[PDB]
């Protein structure tokens, strides 16, 4: 015989083992970067409510139930919630499940108690939601999860199917789990008995040098389970989140049957296109295992009478607007030397609750404005950032945030109009010896000769002038009076005002120092406006906006860490006086519709309008965040909206869709509340009006009083 044949196949097998080594002993796959939202820490004495906490939990993929049994679940009671915080690999320290009770004392979090030992936590970590993945060059997207990470039952459901009961190394006789691992991992497409035998040879070599758990650990992360546009969704972990919005470790049995059922055929059982052949395949799996010992008959009818929820969505590109900022910030910080790495973890500043509320305000708000005014193509952008740290919490780049290609929060450069006014008042108030809230500004006809040849003659909103010819600075800003603003600004000088703009953090090449700049001849994107208003909201510290918190390697190596880098930009006292006045605009000025609806928030804000309302804006500052809202048309035509009411309606819905933090303005040093009389002069005691004043010696009133 030519038995040497068993020899060149033996060497072909030994040399085959050479390939099933360099592959599995290292990078099995190029693993895409995972993008996570914010990690929230809870603390006792935190200002939050139970209903507020419920929303944060549901936004973080938690499910409210009657009785808890699994991670990612929680129960509500009269004055508290009980949850099972799911396990997560926090950069700071890996954590398992924790059964906690958060107890609420009305307005705040009273206690957080470990249900295990009945003791209190000093702070408690909530895991971050997976927002998205960063496209993998392969076109194949995976979320690696170790063996242990898979629930016993989905492994049982998996074994109850494909590899019927085991796979010890009979199946062929009657007429393979390791057999298929190589099929997807090493082999070509289809037709070949040689393929059938080539994998069969790789299967023995495989299951010879690698453990049981290691085979299905690679398998449960390799199987094709979906198609997101032109990206392969494979692996049970990523499929779970993609096909249920919940981790693999937390799938219900009926959801485990579906995924598994979709392994045989992985595209025709797709619950989107045809839910019928998927429902039958699901129930089929439910009857497959029902025969073996794992499944009861009574519960079977439940799982079968258990429709699919199922994400009923496409999710091809989650949070397109915010992800633009993320991609942009990654390039700047780490460069192109990042996607070279596999299994990278990106921790962002994204707030799921805020995003939900902004998106809802945009989606419902815009059609409402179009109906109430008979419009045809109205658009909007919303940016939310943290008051003090400049972290970007939310970004809405269009009235249809779900499906976005053009991101208006970052790309739509638009005249800010009267939103420009605080810069001027901030410039003035930064000089406490000369300009104060009670300083009188002329309000009379203006005529400014400019570079050839026409004369610039700005008018008040109502084409009227103050009967006295003058108005106090406080009231000019409150009422967004055009004429006093130009008189103030021209007296301060366009260079001084322009320098305030740079300190506030606006792009320097957008600044053109001519009179109209004072009234908003300044074109910015919403994210750039947010920077400017964050600087005044923080109390004068410019905190560069960012969407990244950290970037960790698969092994836990820190590729990037964010450190606080706020820069003192304007005096805190001037920032304060400007904000106090912006509280006036919201209570009694142009923003007064908002102060009437949310009196207890004491919001500070500024309306923005342009000639014929081409662009409308609102900038609202609460206790914790700055929200910029823009409403207008892409073609740059008049909106027909009147006043900042369009941007204030969107913002008002934003405020209603979440739980805003009251703004309680704490006065910095050397701020004193002082009375003035009707003439506007300071008085020692009394005064019909009280205004805060930057002074270390309120005895500029003994001086004022000595007029006699």
73: annotated active-site residue? no
Q: How far apart are CA 107 and CA 48, in angstroms?
A: 6
3-state secondary structure of 114: strand
* Strand stretches in 106-195, DSSP E: 108-114, 119-120, 124-125, 130-134, 140-141
Q: Which residue has the tokens 């900038």?
A: 619
Q: Residue 378's beta-bridge partner residues? A: 633
Q: Return the number of other C-beta atoms located less than 10 Å from residue 643's C-beta.
A: 16
Task: Assess contact for 671 and 693: CB atoms under 8 A.
Answer: yes
40-129: CATH number: 3.30.2060.10
Q: How far is CA 309 from CA 129, 229, 249, 255, 306, in A?
A: 18, 22, 16, 9, 9
Breaks in the chain (C to N over 2.5 Å), named by the residue before each, are: 169, 175, 308
Task: Assess contact for 625 and 633: CB atoms under 8 A.
Answer: no
Q: How far is CA 85 from CA 27, 126, 348, 464, in A?
A: 31, 7, 20, 61
CATH topology classification for 130-312: Penicillin binding protein transpeptidase fold (1.10.3810)
Give the torsion sign (CA, 307, 308, 310, 315): negative
Q: Which residue has the tokens 């190596």?
A: 557
Which residues are CB-contacts of 502 (< 8 A; sequence separation ≥ 6)?
508, 511
Q: What residue spans define the domains of the chain?
A: 1-25, 32-39+313-708, 40-129, 130-312
CATH architecture of the domain with residue range 1-25: Up-down Bundle (1.20)
* Maximum distance among all Cα pairs of the chain, rounded to whole angstroms: 130
Q: How far is CA 583 from CA 75, 397, 417, 479, 528, in A?
A: 39, 27, 19, 12, 22
Q: Return the number of other C-beta atoms located less than 10 Å from residue 29's C-beta.
A: 20
Tokens read off for 521: 């001849």
* Strand stretches in 562-670, DSSP E: 567-568, 604-609, 615-621, 625-633
171: annotated active-site residue? no
In the set 80, 136, 162, 645, the catalytic residue is 162
Q: In what order do the strands lie in the sheet with 140-141?
A: 140-141, 231-234, 224-228
Q: Is CATH 3.40.50.720 the classification given to domain 32-39+313-708?
A: no
Q: End-to-end CA distance of the chain, in Å?
A: 130
C-alpha radius of gyration, the chain, whole number: 32
Provide the resolution (angstroms).
2.2
Between CA 647 and CA 583, with CA 461 as vertex, the angle to 5 degrees is: 50
β-pairing verdict for 80-85 and 689-694: unpaired
* Strand stretches in 365-477, DSSP E: 378-386, 392-396, 414-415, 440-442, 448-449, 455-456, 470-472
Between CA 275 and CA 284, with CA 278 as vertex, the angle to 5 degrees is: 145
In the set 80, 136, 418, 480, the catalytic residue is 418
């Amino acid at each position: 015989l030519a038995i040497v044949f068993a020899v060149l196949i033996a060497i072909y097998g030994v040399y085959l083992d050479q390939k099933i080594r360099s592959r599995i002993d290292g990078k099995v796959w190029q693993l895409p970067a995972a993008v996570y939202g914010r990690m929230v820490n809870l603390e006792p004495d935190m200002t939050i409510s139970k209903n507020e906490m419920v929303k944060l939990l549901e936004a973080t993929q938690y499910r409210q139930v009657s009785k808890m049994t699994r991670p990612g679940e929680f129960t509500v009671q009269a004055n508290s919630i009980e949850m099972i915080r799911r396990p997560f690999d926090f950069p700071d320290s890996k954590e398992g499940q924790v059964r906690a009770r958060l107890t609420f004392d009305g307005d705040h979090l009273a206690t957080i108690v470990n249900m295990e030992n009945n003791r209190q936590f000093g702070f408690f970590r909530l895991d971050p939601r997976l927002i998205t993945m960063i496209s993998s060059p392969n076109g194949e997207q995976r979320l690696f999860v170790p063996r242990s990470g898979f629930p016993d039952l989905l492994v049982d459901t998996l074994l109850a199917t494909e590899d019927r009961h085991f796979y010890e190394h009979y199946s062929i006789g009657r007429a393979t789990l390791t057999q298929q691992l190589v099929k997807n991992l090493f082999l070509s497409s289809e037709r070949s008995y040689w393929r059938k035998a080539n994998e069969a040879y790789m299967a023995l070599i495989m299951d010879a040098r690698y453990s049981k758990d290691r085979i299905l650990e690679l398998y449960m992360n390799e199987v094709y389970l979906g198609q997101s546009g032109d990206n392969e969704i494979r692996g049970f972990p990523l499929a779970s989140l993609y096909y249920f919005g919940r981790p693999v470790e937390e799938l219900s049995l009926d959801q485990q049957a579906l995924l598994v059922g979709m392994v045989k055929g992985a595209s025709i059982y797709n619950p989107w296109r045809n839910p019928k052949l998927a429902l039958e395949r699901r129930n089929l799996v439910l009857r497959l295992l029902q025969q073996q010992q794992i499944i009861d008959q009574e519960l079977y009818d439940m799982l079968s009478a258990r429709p699919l929820v199922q994400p009923r969505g496409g999710v091809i590109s989650p949070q397109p607007a915010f992800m633009q900022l993320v991609r942009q910030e990654l390039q700047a910080k780490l460069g192109d030397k990042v996607k070279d790495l596999s299994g990278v973890k990106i921790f962002t500043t994204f707030d799921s609750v805020a995003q939900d509320a902004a998106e809802k305000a945009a989606v419902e708000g815009i059609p409402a404005l179009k109906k109430q005014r008979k419009l045809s193509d109205l658009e909007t952008a919303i940016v939310v950032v943290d008051r003090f740290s400049g972290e970007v919490r939310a970004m809405v780049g269009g009235s249809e945030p779900q499906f976005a290609g053009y991101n208006r929060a970052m790309q739509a450069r638009r005249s800010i109009g009267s939103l420009a006014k605080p810069a001027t008042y901030l410039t003035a108030l930064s000089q406490p010896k000369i300009y104060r809230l009670n300083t009188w500004i002329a309000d009379a006809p203006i005529a400014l000769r400019q570079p050839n040849g026409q004369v610039w003659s700005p008018q008040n909103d109502d084409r009227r002038y103050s009967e006295s010819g003058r108005v106090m600075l406080v009231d000019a800003l409150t009422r967004s009076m055009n004429v006093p603003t130009v008189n103030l600004g021209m007296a301060l000088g366009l260079p001084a005002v322009t320098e305030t703009w740079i300190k506030l953090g606006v792009p320097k090449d957008q600044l053109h120092p001519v009179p109209a700049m004072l009234l908003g001849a300044l074109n910015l994107t919403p994210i750039e406006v947010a920077q400017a208003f964050q600087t005044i909201a923080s109390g004068g510290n410019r905190a560069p906006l960012s969407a990244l918190r950290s970037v960790i390697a698969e092994d836990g190596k820190v590729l990037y860490q964010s450190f606080p880098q706020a820069e003192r930009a304007v005096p805190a006292q001037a920032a304060y006086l400007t904000l106090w006045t912006m509280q006036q605009v919201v209570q009694r000025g142009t923003g007064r519709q908002l102060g009437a609806k949310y009196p207890n928030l004491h919001l500070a804000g500024k309306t923005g309008t342009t000639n014929n309302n081409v662009d409308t804006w609102f900038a609202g500052i609460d206790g914790s965040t700055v929200t910029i809202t823009w409403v207008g048309r892409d073609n740059n035509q008049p909106t027909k909206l009147y006043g900042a009411s369009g941007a204030m309606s969107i913002y008002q819905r934003y405020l209603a869709n979440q739980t805003p933090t009251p703004l309680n303005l704490v006065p910095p040093e050397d701020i004193a509340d002082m009375g003035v009389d009707y003439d506007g002069n300071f008085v020692c005691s009394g005064g019909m009006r009280i205004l805060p004043v930057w002074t270390s010696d309120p005895q500029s009133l003994c001086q004022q009083s000595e007029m006699q």
